[PDB]
Design a protein around this motif. Structure first.
Motif, PDB file in Angstrom:
ATOM      1  N   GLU C  49      29.062  45.325   4.985  1.00 16.14           N
ATOM      2  CA  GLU C  49      29.256  44.555   6.209  1.00 16.14           C
ATOM      3  C   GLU C  49      29.143  45.438   7.445  1.00 16.14           C
ATOM      4  OE1 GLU C  49      29.578  41.317   6.168  1.00 16.14           O
ATOM      5  OE2 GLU C  49      29.824  41.023   4.007  1.00 16.14           O
ATOM      6  N   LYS C  50      29.739  46.632   7.405  1.00 11.53           N
ATOM      7  CA  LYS C  50      29.697  47.526   8.555  1.00 11.53           C
ATOM      8  C   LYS C  50      28.350  48.215   8.723  1.00 11.53           C
ATOM      9  CE  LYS C  50      34.598  48.529   9.116  1.00 11.53           C
ATOM     10  NZ  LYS C  50      35.615  49.583   9.371  1.00 11.53           N
ATOM     11  N   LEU C  51      27.550  48.312   7.661  1.00 17.66           N
ATOM     12  CA  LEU C  51      26.221  48.896   7.796  1.00 17.66           C
ATOM     13  C   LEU C  51      25.332  48.039   8.687  1.00 17.66           C
ATOM     14  CD1 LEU C  51      24.539  51.327   6.822  1.00 17.66           C
ATOM     15  CD2 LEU C  51      23.637  49.837   5.026  1.00 17.66           C
ATOM     16  N   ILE C  52      25.440  46.715   8.562  1.00 20.40           N
ATOM     17  CA  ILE C  52      24.665  45.817   9.410  1.00 20.40           C
ATOM     18  C   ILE C  52      25.094  45.943  10.866  1.00 20.40           C
ATOM     19  CG2 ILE C  52      23.977  43.423   9.770  1.00 20.40           C
ATOM     20  CD1 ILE C  52      22.894  44.654   7.240  1.00 20.40           C
ATOM     21  N   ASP C  53      26.385  46.169  11.116  1.00 27.84           N
ATOM     22  CA  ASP C  53      26.850  46.349  12.489  1.00 27.84           C
ATOM     23  C   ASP C  53      26.194  47.562  13.136  1.00 27.84           C
ATOM     24  OD1 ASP C  53      28.487  44.109  12.385  1.00 27.84           O
ATOM     25  OD2 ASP C  53      30.215  45.247  11.657  1.00 27.84           O
ATOM     26  N   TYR C  54      26.036  48.650  12.381  1.00 26.65           N
ATOM     27  CA  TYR C  54      25.314  49.805  12.902  1.00 26.65           C
ATOM     28  C   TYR C  54      23.843  49.491  13.128  1.00 26.65           C
ATOM     29  CZ  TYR C  54      29.161  53.112  12.445  1.00 26.65           C
ATOM     30  OH  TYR C  54      30.344  53.792  12.604  1.00 26.65           O
ATOM     31  N   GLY C  55      23.259  48.624  12.299  1.00 27.14           N
ATOM     32  CA  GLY C  55      21.886  48.213  12.524  1.00 27.14           C
ATOM     33  C   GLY C  55      21.705  47.447  13.819  1.00 27.14           C
ATOM     34  N   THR C  60      17.445  53.220  18.451  1.00 21.82           N
ATOM     35  CA  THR C  60      17.490  54.195  19.534  1.00 21.82           C
ATOM     36  C   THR C  60      18.851  54.863  19.654  1.00 21.82           C
ATOM     37  OG1 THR C  60      18.124  52.564  21.202  1.00 21.82           O
ATOM     38  CG2 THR C  60      15.775  52.836  20.748  1.00 21.82           C
ATOM     39  N   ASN C  61      19.887  54.289  19.048  1.00 24.89           N
ATOM     40  CA  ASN C  61      21.218  54.880  19.079  1.00 24.89           C
ATOM     41  C   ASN C  61      21.275  56.035  18.088  1.00 24.89           C
ATOM     42  OD1 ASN C  61      24.025  55.444  18.979  1.00 24.89           O
ATOM     43  ND2 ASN C  61      24.497  53.331  19.562  1.00 24.89           N
ATOM     44  N   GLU C  62      21.597  57.231  18.585  1.00 20.03           N
ATOM     45  CA  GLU C  62      21.652  58.402  17.716  1.00 20.03           C
ATOM     46  C   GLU C  62      22.750  58.266  16.669  1.00 20.03           C
ATOM     47  OE1 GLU C  62      22.206  61.582  20.456  1.00 20.03           O
ATOM     48  OE2 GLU C  62      20.136  61.556  21.186  1.00 20.03           O
ATOM     49  N   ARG C  63      23.918  57.758  17.069  1.00 23.89           N
ATOM     50  CA  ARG C  63      25.021  57.605  16.126  1.00 23.89           C
ATOM     51  C   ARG C  63      24.678  56.614  15.022  1.00 23.89           C
ATOM     52  NH1 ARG C  63      30.423  57.955  15.028  1.00 23.89           N
ATOM     53  NH2 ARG C  63      31.434  56.017  14.346  1.00 23.89           N
ATOM     54  N   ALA C  64      24.044  55.494  15.377  1.00 22.79           N
ATOM     55  CA  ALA C  64      23.656  54.515  14.367  1.00 22.79           C
ATOM     56  C   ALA C  64      22.620  55.090  13.409  1.00 22.79           C
ATOM     57  CB  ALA C  64      23.124  53.250  15.037  1.00 22.79           C
ATOM     58  N   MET C  67      24.383  57.463  11.013  1.00 22.05           N
ATOM     59  CA  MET C  67      25.129  56.723  10.001  1.00 22.05           C
ATOM     60  C   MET C  67      24.193  56.092   8.978  1.00 22.05           C
ATOM     61  SD  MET C  67      28.169  56.104   9.018  1.00 22.05           S
ATOM     62  CE  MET C  67      28.986  56.678  10.503  1.00 22.05           C
ATOM     63  N   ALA C  68      23.069  55.537   9.437  1.00 26.10           N
ATOM     64  CA  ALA C  68      22.092  54.974   8.513  1.00 26.10           C
ATOM     65  C   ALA C  68      21.412  56.056   7.687  1.00 26.10           C
ATOM     66  CB  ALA C  68      21.051  54.161   9.278  1.00 26.10           C
ATOM     67  N   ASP C  69      21.218  57.244   8.265  1.00 25.71           N
ATOM     68  CA  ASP C  69      20.606  58.341   7.522  1.00 25.71           C
ATOM     69  C   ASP C  69      21.466  58.752   6.335  1.00 25.71           C
ATOM     70  OD1 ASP C  69      18.992  60.421   6.723  1.00 25.71           O
ATOM     71  OD2 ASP C  69      19.652  61.793   8.301  1.00 25.71           O
ATOM     72  N   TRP C  71      23.971  56.969   4.702  1.00 23.01           N
ATOM     73  CA  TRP C  71      24.269  55.944   3.710  1.00 23.01           C
ATOM     74  C   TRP C  71      23.036  55.396   3.005  1.00 23.01           C
ATOM     75  CZ3 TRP C  71      28.874  54.617   1.725  1.00 23.01           C
ATOM     76  CH2 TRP C  71      30.016  55.064   2.397  1.00 23.01           C
ATOM     77  N   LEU C  72      21.839  55.688   3.492  1.00 21.41           N
ATOM     78  CA  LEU C  72      20.603  55.253   2.849  1.00 21.41           C
ATOM     79  C   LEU C  72      19.915  56.488   2.280  1.00 21.41           C
ATOM     80  CD1 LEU C  72      19.415  52.566   5.405  1.00 21.41           C
ATOM     81  CD2 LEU C  72      20.558  52.237   3.212  1.00 21.41           C
ATOM     82  N   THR C  73      20.106  56.722   0.980  1.00 21.80           N
ATOM     83  CA  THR C  73      19.529  57.894   0.336  1.00 21.80           C
ATOM     84  C   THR C  73      18.011  57.820   0.252  1.00 21.80           C
ATOM     85  OG1 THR C  73      19.854  56.900  -1.845  1.00 21.80           O
ATOM     86  CG2 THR C  73      21.617  58.293  -0.983  1.00 21.80           C
ATOM     87  N   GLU C  74      17.442  56.621   0.276  1.00 26.15           N
ATOM     88  CA  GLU C  74      15.998  56.432   0.308  1.00 26.15           C
ATOM     89  C   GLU C  74      15.593  56.114   1.741  1.00 26.15           C
ATOM     90  OE1 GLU C  74      15.647  53.246  -2.417  1.00 26.15           O
ATOM     91  OE2 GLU C  74      15.814  54.510  -4.204  1.00 26.15           O
ATOM     92  N   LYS C  75      14.817  57.013   2.351  1.00 28.39           N
ATOM     93  CA  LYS C  75      14.564  56.945   3.784  1.00 28.39           C
ATOM     94  C   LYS C  75      13.645  55.798   4.182  1.00 28.39           C
ATOM     95  CE  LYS C  75      17.253  60.235   3.782  1.00 28.39           C
ATOM     96  NZ  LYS C  75      18.676  59.903   4.057  1.00 28.39           N
ATOM     97  N   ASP C  76      12.980  55.147   3.227  1.00 26.21           N
ATOM     98  CA  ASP C  76      12.178  53.978   3.568  1.00 26.21           C
ATOM     99  C   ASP C  76      13.042  52.771   3.906  1.00 26.21           C
ATOM    100  OD1 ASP C  76      13.030  53.807   0.879  1.00 26.21           O
ATOM    101  OD2 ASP C  76      11.496  52.289   0.475  1.00 26.21           O
ATOM    102  N   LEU C  77      14.311  52.774   3.495  1.00 28.02           N
ATOM    103  CA  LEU C  77      15.206  51.666   3.793  1.00 28.02           C
ATOM    104  C   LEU C  77      15.783  51.736   5.200  1.00 28.02           C
ATOM    105  CD1 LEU C  77      17.152  51.420   0.416  1.00 28.02           C
ATOM    106  CD2 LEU C  77      15.130  50.153   1.155  1.00 28.02           C
TER     107      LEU C  77
END
Ligand SMILES: [Mg+2]
Ligand SMILES: [Mg+2]
Ligand SMILES: [Mg+2]
Ligand SMILES: [Zn+2]
Lengths: 294, 286, 154, 166, 150, 44, 221, 110
Positions: C49-55, C60-64, C67-69, C71-77
């Motif tokens: 649920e909180k991953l979508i909030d960061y999306g 352009t948000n460095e923090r987002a 955080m996505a970098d 928690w997403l071990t596969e960089k295509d996601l």
């Protein structure tokens, strides 16, 4: 005239006489092919006995779940009692309380509890007073209650049942539920029905009305235990389906000048759809209000 | 495999006994079993009872109507007159009629105060199937009985027993036959109570009628003893008083039951069937 | 005394717990519907649920992006999160995922659950549906509801 | 070994008289050499004892024990056996009359302990026995009531005699 | 022991001895061996004792069957239906005669423990004791601490 | 024989209605007791 | 089990054929009675002559009476399960048909009357020396009244009635091993005409299940 | 520690057959309306869930064929289409997955 105890005995003997008469018409055990067109277990074919096997017997071939859940049967797109013998090859569908559009089942349950209340009323009053059942009005389920029109003796003109009297009716109905009496259905000609209910004027008019509508002038008779009544349509299989049952109130219909017609009312729910204690009280309040068929 | 034969033989008999217990064979007539001589058993039947039976009459007593018809059927099936065998119907009628008259005479003399209703029920009890068959089975009548169906039905066995009495009636006479009835049918009332044999309904109603015939006022029921009235195990002694004089008293768990018991005690005293009454005199007549 | 403890103890430790949830979360984003033991799905559901909030914060948000970098071990996601999942729930303030219990796993009889992102292209799950409004109990309550509204207006 | 349970389906009863009551159909089925413990299988056999054929299947389907699938498979092939071979009209008109587990032939294996010592483990096997009787399941025995207790106690007090006397 | 064996009360058959005495023994079935050594005493009994015994018991039917047997036996059947089988294996003539006479004197009831060495259908003549047998009555039947006419 | 809860058989429309119905009744019942001295109080 | 071990001098000795050499199709409407004719008769006569070669003292006229006795006694063996005598009355092709379905059931079959005398409709023989054996099959038309009452394993009535005979019109095929000196005429099979009326309905009701569909599969009309 | 004495079968039966150790009868079993198979009230139907998973597996295999390798996740939405169907106005610009079968009745197109 006949005593009330003898009156039931005469009706039951006539009812059994016609029932055994229809049984003899069946030549040996002729087979019929009943195709299951329901959503579940499609393509199932039941090789049943003509005029002997019932839709409940078809459900016994499938599983116990069908027997417990099925309340009404759909034969060739028409409502059919679970214990009504099948007369020809047809397509059968089983209907439950929790269907998408259980309109026919709701009518059957309401038509079944009204008959149960009618049985209670006839045997509730003392032999000194005369009780005549008129009919069971076809009121919608959304009206909040089922009603039964009853005409009592002229002595009970200024008498209204008390709260304890209403609770007495409820206990008698719950005794009927405990007995677990199946609803026995029998389609007979108008002539046979008139002979059974020749002692009641209101039933004779009611039977004539039903016979006039049908080109063959055939009426439907239903019996639980020793109580026989004319019903507007199919009923539930057994009295054990009802779980919460209560007679709400009695109202005097108007005008009272020709005769005093009393409308008994009550609300019931089956085992499958039993409600909470708090919700059940709310439904009791609405059931006490007078309902007018439209 | 241990050497020997006796241990194996002994174990086989134990297995056979267990097999019989698990699946008992259906009962069969003693005649069908080995070591049976019908003529010898008939003679011993009279000697056990110390009666000079006539062999011609006694044998016909055990011949039943069903046996004759079954025997005739078997001959027709096998395609085989010599079967002119007389049944026991004539003897049974004589035996039954004499037994009822003999029992009535015994009870009337012993209990003159007993009404005809009470005497008739006692005679019916003594001549009833339950009493007669119990005596007949223990007198080896059943073994000698020739019947189509085994075991002999109680209706058929009762007819056979009275046929024996009828055969004894012609063989010895009424005086000797009365002792035989006394020694085997009167003895059945040894421990039995009056109302255990004569079953009645509403003894209080019958008691009132008896007192009216004796010109005695209606009895009054009063509580003589009482214990544990408010508990679950009460005791009540209801006494019946006529002209303020006690005639009977009876215990019971409730007043209604105790009052009913008192009426039974009153009837026993009036009819002479008290528990401590004079025992039956079985001694030889003088 | 686990009073007020909101985080389950799973894996080989605290760090192993995050990696186990991260692999489930990475699998959830790629397939938009995964099945796993009920406890792990429930633990992972909060992070989904909180991953979508960061999306919704934008790429352009460095923090987002950081955080996505992680928690997403596969960089295509990562492009999928900021360009597919986040725009999908633009008009939703929550309830991005639905968790339902499925029959127990065949091997170890473990309590299993299925979690998916709402609005996926996969065939719908057999969602439990309430009783129809045309049932006997619902009709009585509907009649009661109509009576109250009529009396209120009067 | 004994295989008497398989032989109980070969009993042919004599034809009934017209006045005799209908005899319920009895079906005996079993599975031999099940790789399961009879102690663990007993609880599953005890669970469905006395239930109807359909209710027993429902309880076993959602049971996490391994033997639940095995017993359910036995009931499914026994239910079909009743209608196909034993002349049962309705396949749902059956109830579990008898259901119990028995020990089977087991294999012994060596389990290694420390200090050069060992123990002997057995590869346990079990048999499952089930008996199906045609007809609705018998009703459960109602609990003993206060009236029954009081009636029994009074009967006890009314049956006592004066002992060690005439 | 008594607990491990059945028991019964003392009784008779058809109240035997009340009106008349009837010998309860009904049938005796002997099985003797012509050549068997263990049946030597049984043969001696048949030669000289069974004929006189039959004279004294006209009501008992005695069946003597001579067939090959290792253990000779005598079967006694009574009026009540009880069947008792006794072995006469390697018994002298005197022992057999005592055994046969013992069977004739028995009533045929089961030889087990008898609870009471007496039986009576009328144990009381003056009335069985009850708690009010020796309790005097009070005026108006008043219970203790009871007030009359309140 | 199966257990039940209050909103098992309720439809989508009925659940908000039932919650509102019982909640309003509870507030009305509590508000009716706000004047104990005007409803025949026991002697003080 | 299909074939014995290979390369063995001993071979399985069959005592009857597996089927009918030439099926006799009864004419339509024959029950109502209750160029090509000459050709069928001539073919039958040729087979009769070959039968009379192995058995000189054989008469076609006496066969229907003999066939009737075999038919009655063969079915009476089913009542008491006398399989020992049944093998002498029916062939090995006919024995499994009669006894497989009644192993755990009680059969009460009786013969009441013969409505019409039995007529021999076809006599034919197999090809000469198929495996050193020559077989002869005779088909007999029987129109008799019979009573059947089959009880299930528990002694409950299952099919037919014990006191109501009904007309039966069936064509019984007999067979004899001509080459075997100890061979005898035994029942071989029965011919069921396509126009034969359906049998009486059974007592119990039967459910025919529909297709069992996997979750991936869907139901189709 | 070691047992002082052997525990009898009478003692063992009381422990083993105690109602706490016996299996409890479940009352939350109901028939699935869609297929007629049994299910629990709080648990998705096994037959229906397998039906969805079978179709989901086929769709995911077709997705991999279009992607043709790892790390090929598209940056656009996905729409599954069946035989006899064409993309709609709302489906323009989205990845299209084609299944060589008729659309299931329970899989409603959106
Ligand atoms: Mg905690
Ligand atoms: Mg762990
Ligand atoms: Mg061990
Ligand atoms: Zn489902």
């Amino acid at each position: 005239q006949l005593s009330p105890t003898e009156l039931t005995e005469m009706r039951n003997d006539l009812f059994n006489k016609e029932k055994a008469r229809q049984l003899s018409l069946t030549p040996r055990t002729e087979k019929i092919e009943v195709k299951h067109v329901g959503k579940t277990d499609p393509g199932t074919v039941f090789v049943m006995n003509k005029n002997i096997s019932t839709p409940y017997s078809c459900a016994m071939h499938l599983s116990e779940w069908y027997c417990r859940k099925s309340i009404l049967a759909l034969v060739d797109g028409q409502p059919w009692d679970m214990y009504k013998p099948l007369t020809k090859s047809c397509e059968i569908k089983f209907l439950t309380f929790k269907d998408c559009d259980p309109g026919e089942v709701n009518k059957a349950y309401w038509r079944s509890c009204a008959m149960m209340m009618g049985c209670v009323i006839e045997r509730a009053f003392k032999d000194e007073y005369m009780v005549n059942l008129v009919r069971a009005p076809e009121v919608p389920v959304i009206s909040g209650a089922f009603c039964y029109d009853v005409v009592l003796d002229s002595k009970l003109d200024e008498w209204m049942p008390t709260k304890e009297n209403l609770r007495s009716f409820t206990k008698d109905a719950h005794a009927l539920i405990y007995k677990d009496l199946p609803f026995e259905t029998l389609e007979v000609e108008a002539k046979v029905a008139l002979e059974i209910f020749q002692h009641s004027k209101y039933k004779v008019d009611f039977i004539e009305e039903k016979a006039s509508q049908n080109p063959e002038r055939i009426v439907k008779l239903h019996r639980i235990g020793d109580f026989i009544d004319v019903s507007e349509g199919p009923l539930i299989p057994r009295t054990s389906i009802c779980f919460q049952y209560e007679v709400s109130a009695v109202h005097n219909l108007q005008p009272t000048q020709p005769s005093l017609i009393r409308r008994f009312q009550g609300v019931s729910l089956p085992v499958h759809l039993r409600a909470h204690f708090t919700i059940w009280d709310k439904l009791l309040e609405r059931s006490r209000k007078m309902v007018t068929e439209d | 495999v241990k050497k020997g034969f006796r241990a194996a033989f002994r174990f086989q008999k134990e297995l056979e006994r267990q097999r019989l217990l698990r699946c008992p064979p259906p009962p069969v007539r003693r005649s069908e079993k080995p070591n049976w001589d019908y003529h010898a058993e008939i003679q011993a039947f009279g000697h056990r009872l110390q009666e000079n039976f006539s062999l011609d009459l006694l044998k016909t007593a055990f011949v039943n109507s069903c046996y004759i018809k079954s025997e005739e059927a078997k001959r027709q099936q096998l395609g085989i007159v010599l079967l002119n065998l007389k049944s026991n119907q004539e003897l049974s009628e004589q035996g039954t009629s004499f037994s009822q008259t003999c029992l009535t005479q015994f009870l009337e003399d012993e209990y003159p105060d007993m009404p005809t209703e009470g005497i008739k029920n006692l005679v019916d009890f003594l001549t009833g199937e339950e009493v007669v068959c119990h005596v007949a089975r223990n007198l080896a009548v059943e073994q000698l009985t020739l019947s189509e169906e085994f075991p002999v039905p109680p209706a058929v066995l009762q007819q056979t027993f009275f046929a024996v009495i009828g055969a004894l009636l012609q063989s010895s006479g009424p005086e000797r036959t009365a002792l035989f009835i006394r020694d085997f049918l009167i003895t059945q009332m040894t421990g039995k109570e009056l109302f255990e044999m004569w079953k009645i309904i509403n003894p209080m109603g019958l008691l009132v009628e008896e007192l009216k015939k004796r010109n005695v006022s209606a009895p009054e029921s009063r509580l003589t003893r009482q214990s544990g009235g408010t508990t679950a195990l009460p005791l009540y002694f209801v006494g019946l008083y006529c002209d303020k004089k006690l005639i009977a008293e009876g215990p019971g768990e409730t007043v209604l039951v105790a009052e009913e018991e008192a009426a039974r005690v009153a009837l026993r005293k009036l009819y002479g069937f008290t528990e401590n009454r004079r025992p039956w005199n079985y001694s030889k007549p003088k | 005394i686990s009073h007020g403890r909101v985080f389950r103890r799973m894996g080989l430790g605290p760090e192993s717990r995050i990696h186990l949830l991260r692999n489930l979360l990475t699998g959830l984003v790629r397939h938009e519907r995964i099945e796993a033991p009920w406890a792990r799905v429930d633990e992972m559901r909060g992070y989904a649920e909180k991953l979508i909030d960061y999306g919704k914060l934008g790429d352009t948000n460095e923090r987002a992006m950081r955080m996505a970098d992680f928690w997403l071990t596969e960089k295509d996601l990562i492009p999928k999160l900021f360009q597919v999942l986040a725009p999908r729930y633009k008009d939703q303030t929550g309830g991005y995922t639905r968790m339902l219990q499925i029959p127990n796993r065949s091997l170890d009889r473990a309590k299993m659950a299925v979690i998916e992102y709402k609005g996926n292209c996969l065939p719908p799950l057999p969602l439990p549906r309430r009783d129809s409004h045309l049932t006997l109990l619902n009709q009585l309550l509907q009649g009661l509801r109509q009576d109250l509204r009529q009396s209120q207006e009067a | 070994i004994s295989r008497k349970w398989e032989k109980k389906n070969k009993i042919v009863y004599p034809p009934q008289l017209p006045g005799e009551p209908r005899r319920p159909a009895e079906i005996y089925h079993c599975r031999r050499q099940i790789k399961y413990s009879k102690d663990k299988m007993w609880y599953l056999a005890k669970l469905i004892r006395g239930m109807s054929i359909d209710q027993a299947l429902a309880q076993l389907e959602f049971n996490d024990k391994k033997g639940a699938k095995i017993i359910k498979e036995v009931l499914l092939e026994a239910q079909d056996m009743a209608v196909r071979d034993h002349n049962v009209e309705f396949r749902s008109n059956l109830y579990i009359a008898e259901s119990t587990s028995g020990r089977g032939q087991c294999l012994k294996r060596i389990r290694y302990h420390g200090r050069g010592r060992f123990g002997i483990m057995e590869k346990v096997y079990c048999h499952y026995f089930v008996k199906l009787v045609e007809g609705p399941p018998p009703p459960p025995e109602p609990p003993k009531t206060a009236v029954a207790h009081a009636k029994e106690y009074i009967q006890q007090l009314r049956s006592r005699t004066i002992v060690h006397t005439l | 022991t008594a607990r491990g064996t059945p028991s019964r009360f003392l009784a008779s058959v058809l109240h035997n001895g009340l009106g008349r005495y009837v010998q309860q023994l009904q049938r005796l079935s002997f099985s003797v061996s012509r050549d068997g050594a263990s049946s030597r005493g049984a043969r001696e009994f048949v030669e000289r004792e069974v004929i006189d015994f039959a004279r004294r018991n006209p009501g008992v039917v005695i069946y003597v069957n001579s067939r090959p047997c290792c253990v000779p036996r005598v079967v006694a059947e009574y009026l009540n239906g009880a069947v008792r089988e006794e072995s006469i294996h390697c018994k002298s003539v005197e022992e057999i005669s005592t055994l046969v006479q013992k069977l004739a004197d028995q009533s045929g009831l089961d030889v087990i423990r008898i609870r009471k060495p007496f039986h009576t259908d009328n144990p009381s003549i003056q009335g069985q004791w009850h708690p009010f047998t020796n309790k005097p009555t009070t005026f108006r039947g008043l219970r203790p601490r009871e007030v009359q006419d309140p | 024989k199966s257990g039940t809860w209050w909103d098992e058989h309720l439809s989508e429309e009925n659940v908000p209605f039932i919650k509102q119905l019982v909640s309003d009744e509870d507030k009305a019942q509590l508000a009716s007791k706000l004047c104990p001295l005007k409803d025949e109080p026991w002697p003080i | 089990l299909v074939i014995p071990p290979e390369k063995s001098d001993r071979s399985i000795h069959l005592a009857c054929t597996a089927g009918i050499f030439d099926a006799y199709v009864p004419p339509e409407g024959d029950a109502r009675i209750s160029t090509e004719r000459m050709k069928k008769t001539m073919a039958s006569q040729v087979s009769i002559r070959r039968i009379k070669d192995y058995d000189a003292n054989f008469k076609i006229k006496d066969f229907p009476e003999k066939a009737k006795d075999i038919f009655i006694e063969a079915h009476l063996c089913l009542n008491n399960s006398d399989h020992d005598r049944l093998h002498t009355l029916v062939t090995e092709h006919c024995f499994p048909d009669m006894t497989w379905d009644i192993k755990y059931k009680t059969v009460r079959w009786s013969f009441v009357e013969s409505l019409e005398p039995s007529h021999v409709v076809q006599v034919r023989c197999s090809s000469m020396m198929n495996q050193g054996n020559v077989y002869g099959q005779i088909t007999v038309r029987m129109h008799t009244r019979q009573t059947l009452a089959i009880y299930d394993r528990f002694g409950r009535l299952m099919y037919g009635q014990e006191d109501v005979p009904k007309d039966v019109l069936e064509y019984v095929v007999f067979e004899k091993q001509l080459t075997n000196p100890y061979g005898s005429w035994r029942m071989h099979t029965k011919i069921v005409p396509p126009w034969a009326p359906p049998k009486q309905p059974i007592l119990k009701t039967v459910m025919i299940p529909g297709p069992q569909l996997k979750p991936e599969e869907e139901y189709e009309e | 520690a070691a047992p002082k004495n052997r525990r009898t079968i009478e003692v063992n039966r009381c422990r083993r057959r105690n109602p706490q150790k016996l299996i409890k009868v479940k009352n939350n079993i109901d028939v699935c309306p869609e297929c007629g198979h049994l299910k629990q009230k709080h648990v998705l139907c096994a037959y229906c869930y397998e039906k969805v998973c079978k179709e989901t597996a086929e769709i995911r295999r077709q997705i991999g064929k279009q992607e043709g390798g790892p790390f090929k996740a598209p940056t656009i939405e996905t729409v599954v289409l069946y035989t006899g169907e064409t993309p709609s106005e709302q489906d323009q610009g989205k990845r299209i997955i084609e299944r060589d079968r008729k659309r299931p009745s329970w899989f409603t197109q959106n």
